[PDB]
Amino acid sequence: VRPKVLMRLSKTKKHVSRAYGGSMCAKCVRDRIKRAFLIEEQKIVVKVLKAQAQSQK
Amino acid sequence: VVNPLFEKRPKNFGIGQDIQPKRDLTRFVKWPRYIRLQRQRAILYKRLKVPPAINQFTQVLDRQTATQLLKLAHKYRPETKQEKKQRLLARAEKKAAKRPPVLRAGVNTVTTLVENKKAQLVVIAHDVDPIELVVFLPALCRKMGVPYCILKGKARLGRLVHRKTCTTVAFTQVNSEDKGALAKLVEAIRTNYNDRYDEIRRHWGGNVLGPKSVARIAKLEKAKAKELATKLG
Amino acid sequence: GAYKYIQELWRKKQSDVMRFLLRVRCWQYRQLSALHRAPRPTRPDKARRLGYKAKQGYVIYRIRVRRG
Amino acid sequence: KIRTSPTFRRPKTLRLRRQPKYPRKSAPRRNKLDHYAIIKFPLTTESAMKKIEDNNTLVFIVDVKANKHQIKQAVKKLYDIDVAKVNTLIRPDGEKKAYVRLAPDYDALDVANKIGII
Amino acid sequence: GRVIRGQRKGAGSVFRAHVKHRKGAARLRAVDFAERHGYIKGIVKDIIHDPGRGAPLAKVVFRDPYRFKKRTELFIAAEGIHTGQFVYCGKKAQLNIGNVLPVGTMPEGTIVCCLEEKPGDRGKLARASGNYATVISHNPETKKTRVKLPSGSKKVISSANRAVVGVVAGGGRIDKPILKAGRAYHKYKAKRNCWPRVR
RNA sequence: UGAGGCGGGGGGGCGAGGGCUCUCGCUUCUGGCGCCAAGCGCCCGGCGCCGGGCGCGACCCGCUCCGGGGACAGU
RNA sequence: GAGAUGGGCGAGCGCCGUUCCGAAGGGACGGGCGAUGGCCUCCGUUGCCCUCAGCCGAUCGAAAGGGAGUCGGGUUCAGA
Numbered sequence: 042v043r044p045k046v047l048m049r050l051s052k053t054k055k056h057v058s059r060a061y062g063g064s065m066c067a068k069c070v071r072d073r074i075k076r077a078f079l080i081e082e083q084k085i086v087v088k089v090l091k092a093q094a095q096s097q098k
Numbered sequence: 099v100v101n102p103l104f105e106k107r108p109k110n111f112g113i114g115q116d117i118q119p120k121r122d123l124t125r126f127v128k129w130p131r132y133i134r135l136q137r138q139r140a141i142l143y144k145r146l147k148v149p150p151a152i153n154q155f156t157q158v159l160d161r162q163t164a165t166q167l168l169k170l171a172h173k174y175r176p177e178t179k180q181e182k183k184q185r186l187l188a189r190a191e192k193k194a195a196k197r198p199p200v201l202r203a204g205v206n207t208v209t210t211l212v213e214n215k216k217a218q219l220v221v222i223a224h225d226v227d228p229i230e231l232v233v234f235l236p237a238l239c240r241k242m243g244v245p246y247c248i249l250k251g252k253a254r255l256g257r258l259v260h261r262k263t264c265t266t267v268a269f270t271q272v273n274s275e276d277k278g279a280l281a282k283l284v285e286a287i288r289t290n291y292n293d294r295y296d297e298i299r300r301h302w303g304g305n306v307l308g309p310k311s312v313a314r315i316a317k318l319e320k321a322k323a324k325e326l327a328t329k330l331g
Numbered sequence: 332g333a334y335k336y337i338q339e340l341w342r343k344k345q346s347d348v349m350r351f352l353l354r355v356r357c358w359q360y361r362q363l364s365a366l367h368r369a370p371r372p373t374r375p376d377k378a379r380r381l382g383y384k385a386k387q388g389y390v391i392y393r394i395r396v397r398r399g
Numbered sequence: 400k401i402r403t404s405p406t407f408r409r410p411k412t413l414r415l416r417r418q419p420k421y422p423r424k425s426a427p428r429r430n431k432l433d434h435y436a437i438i439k440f441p442l443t444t445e446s447a448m449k450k451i452e453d454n455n456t457l458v459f460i461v462d463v464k465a466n467k468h469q470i471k472q473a474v475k476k477l478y479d480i481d482v483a484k485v486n487t488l489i490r491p492d493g494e495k496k497a498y499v500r501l502a503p504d505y506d507a508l509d510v511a512n513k514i515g516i517i
Numbered sequence: 518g519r520v521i522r523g524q525r526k527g528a529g530s531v532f533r534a535h536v537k538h539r540k541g542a543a544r545l546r547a548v549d550f551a552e553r554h555g556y557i558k559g560i561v562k563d564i565i566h567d568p569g570r571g572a573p574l575a576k577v578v579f580r581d582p583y584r585f586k587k588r589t590e591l592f593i594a595a596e597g598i599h600t601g602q603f604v605y606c607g608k609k610a611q612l613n614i615g616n617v618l619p620v621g622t623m624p625e626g627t628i629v630c631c632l633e634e635k636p637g638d639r640g641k642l643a644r645a646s647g648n649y650a651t652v653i654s655h656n657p658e659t660k661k662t663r664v665k666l667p668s669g670s671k672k673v674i675s676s677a678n679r680a681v682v683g684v685v686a687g688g689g690r691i692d693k694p695i696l697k698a699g700r701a702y703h704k705y706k707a708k709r710n711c712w713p714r715v716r
Numbered sequence: 717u718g719a720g721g722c723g724g725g726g727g728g729g730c731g732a733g734g735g736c737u738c739u740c741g742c743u744u745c746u747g748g749c750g751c752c753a754a755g756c757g758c759c760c761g762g763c764g765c766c767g768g769g770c771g772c773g774a775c776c777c778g779c780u781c782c783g784g785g786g787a788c789a790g791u
Numbered sequence: 792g793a794g795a796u797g798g799g800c801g802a803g804c805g806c807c808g809u810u811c812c813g814a815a816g817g818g819a820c821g822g823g824c825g826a827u828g829g830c831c832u833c834c835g836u837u838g839c840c841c842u843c844a845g846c847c848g849a850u851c852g853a854a855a856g857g858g859a860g861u862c863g864g865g866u867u868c869a870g871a
Contacts, residue, residue, distance in 0.1 A: 045859050077748040107754045113555030114743045118583050122401040128719040130814050135362050149347045206332030228373050234336045310723055405719050409814035585751035601747040
C-alpha cells in the first residue's frame, strides 16, 4: 500500500511478529543468526591460540 | 558479599577496532575568523626580527617590585568626581565666613613635564595598540635622565585612576615620608633600564622558529653530529 | 604634548621601526573584511589634525581599496 | 573545558523582550470589518427566491475581504439565527456572494420577511 | 566577425555537462587517522553505472570510528571486485585487487589505478575505462616515487598519495566499433552537446 | 576535512651483541554486531536504604587545523 | 534552473557567485533550579544552570512531475 496510507493501517499489517520483522526477509535473517554466532565463536578460537604463544616464547 | 554479576568490560580503541570516545579536541577546533587572526599575531611577534625599540616592551619589570610601586601609587590617586565635589564644597564654604603632589595620566601630560624635568619616576604600559605612541618615550627619558619602568598590562595600571586604560603615569613629587620608599626603587630601576641603555639597542626581538621546525633542524643537527664523532675513533 | 613626537615618527616610513609596524597592520587588515569598523584611531596624530575629536559620535571605518 | 566537536558553535546569547518607552502608533485602529460592513445587502433575484424555498438558505452580497467564519457570525448576530454552513463565491462584478444554509429548525421563508425580501 | 564554435564552449550554458542522472563525485575516501597509521575495513555494497563514464562505479560502505554512523563512498571499481568483498583501506593493508594504500609501502612495478597527484585529493590519475599506473621507482630519501602514467609520460610524485590495485573495469571498450551514428549520438547525449561536429 | 588525534619527550611486547639503535602501542577467510563507560579508586549530600562529583580508564608537552609549494608562481 | 545573505569585485546603479575566506542551530531531550494556574493534586505554562545536535545551505521554481481523503440518485432558462 502507498506509504502515506501507512498511518492508517495498524502495527500488525506493517510488520511480522519476529526479530527484524517487517524490515528484513527471514531467509536472510537466519543467515544473519548463523553469521553472528560463528564469527564470535571463531573469535574465541583466536584468543586461545594466542594464549600459548608467549608462554613458550 | 560482592555481586559477581559485575563484569569488567574494557574497550580497545585500536585502529579500526572500537569507536573513539569523547576525548579532547582543543588543538583541532576550527577557530572563528577573529580568533585565528588573534593568535597568529602573537606568532608574528616571535617569527620576525622585532626591532629593539619595541622589543624593549617584553623586557618588563618583575612581579614583586610591581607590588610595592603600586602600593606606593595607591597613595597618590587622583581626586574623583566625588573627591572634586568634596573638594569644591570645602573651598566654597570657606568663601563665605595648596595642592598635594598627585600623578599625571596620559602621554600629553607626561611628555611635557619630562622636557621640563619635573618627573621623578615614570610608569609605562606595554600593550598599547598603536605602540608608536610609546616607542619614543623610553629612549627619551634616557636622554632626560628620568627613571622609567615598564609594567605588564594597561588595565591594572588603568585602575590607579577610575578610568579604563592609562598609558603613562608620572611621579613628579611625593610626601615627606615617601622619600626613602622611591630612592631605593630608582636605584633598583635605573640598573635595568637607563644605565643599561646600550645593551638594549643590540638585542633584537623575535627571530624564533617553530617547535615543528626547531624539532626538524635540530634533529639533523643531532644526526650529523652523531656521525662525525665516531669518524675519529 | 606627545603628538609632535608621533608626528615626526610617521614621516620615517622607511625606518626599521616603521617598516616593521607598517607590515603588521598591512598583514592584519588583509585578513579582515573589505569594510568594517575600527574602535579607535590607529593613527591619532593624523586624526585630530583632520578634525577628529575623541568623543561620542565620532566613528571611523577602516576599509581596503584595490590597488592599481 | 574540553571541546568535543572541532566546529565551534556560536554561543546561545540571551535576548531581551520589547519593553518600549512608547507605542509606535497612537490607538488601536478600529476594525473596518465589523458586523455591518461585512453584510452589504441581500438579493432580489428570480433565481434567488427558488433557492430559498427548496434549500432553506439565504443569499447575500458580502464584502470581498471576509471569510466564511466571519459570514457565519455576522448572520448569527444581526438577524439572530443559527447557521449550518456558508458557501461563498465571487461574482463576475467583483463582490462576494454567499449562500447561508441556516439551522434546520428554522424557516428562512419567514426570516426573509424580517429582512424584507419577498 | 562572428564568434567561433570553439570560443562559445568556454561560456557554457549549452555545452555544460548533462549532470542529471550522474551518481556523484567518484572520489577516494578522504585521509584520516585510521588511514594514516593503520588500515580500515570496508564493504562493497553494489556496483552502479554512472552515465557518461565508460568505467563503472562501486558503492563501498564504511563504519566511521568517531560517531556511530555508516559512511558510504563512491570508489572507481577495479576489475575483479564482487559484492560482499571486504576491501581494506589504509597503509597497513595488504596487496591485492581493490585495496588502496600509499605507494611508498608497495614494492616496485605494481599495477595500480585511480591514483592521486597530491596527498589527499581523493584521486585524479588513471581512472578512465581500463587504464592503470605502474610504480617505477621509489626513493627512501625525501619520500619520492617515479610512476608511469597511461600516456607514456613518466612522472615524479610523492609517496603518501595512494591508489587502488588493479585495472579499472570495462577495459578495451574502444575495441567495439560503433557502427551507426545513433550509438555515438546516444553516447555523447550523456556528456555534453558536442557530438555533431561540423568541419 | 564537520578542520578528530600533528610533532617532540615519556609506558610496555618483537629481536642479536642493564641502558642504548629501532621496528611496534594491538583490527584480514566470512554480506553479523559496535553511540549514549564499564571497571576502578576517591570525595560530598540525604533517611543498611536512594542519589551527585573529581581523576584514571583514554600519558605528558607544545605555537603554527593537517598537508604540499615558496620568495618562485601571482597581482 | 532562478535568486538573497557572508564574502569578493565595482567610479557607480550594481554585478559576481550559492557552500564557497562565515561564531550560518534560537532547537529540543531529560536533569537540577526558580515560579504559575485550573480540585497551584498531577499535569499545562514561562525563566536560569547542566546535558544533547552533522547539516547544508534564506528563498523561488510543475493548475501534465510527487502529493492522505467522495461516490450514486435527483435538482436548474443557465452551475455541479
